[PDB]
């Protein structure tokens, strides 16, 4: 690791990825199918 490594910033990637909004809809769809 070092100051010039890739240094992922997970919260920034999350917002850049639209907060995984399509995953959220998918998770919601699967959740309400329980039982």
């Amino acid at each position: 690791a070092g100051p010039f490594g890739p240094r992922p910033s997970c919260p920034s990637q999350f917002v850049s990825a639209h907060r995984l909004s399509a995953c959220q809809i998918w998770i919601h769809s699967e959740a309400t199918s329980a039982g």
Partner: protein
């Protein structure tokens, strides 16, 4: 068959993240859905978090696999 279009979109979004961020961000996404939608029935809450933890597999994050279980909030 090809996958449901919404699932494919989810994988496109997940691919915008590094493998070592996927499980943390999917936990965040699961909490966001659970709270925004007011999901409280026990089996629905369990299936919500389980579905989130299994997404890296279908989205081909082979180095991640299934995200580890973490006790569900509230």
């Amino acid at each position: 068959q090809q996958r449901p279009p919404l699932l494919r979109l989810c994988c496109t979004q997940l691919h915008l993240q590094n493998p070592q961020c996927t499980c943390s961000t999917l936990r965040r996404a699961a909490m966001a859905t659970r709270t925004r939608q007011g999901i409280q029935a026990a089996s629905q809450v369990q299936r919500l978090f389980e579905t989130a933890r299994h997404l890296p597999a279908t989205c081909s994050f082979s180095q991640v696999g299934v995200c580890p279980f973490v006790a569900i909030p509230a």
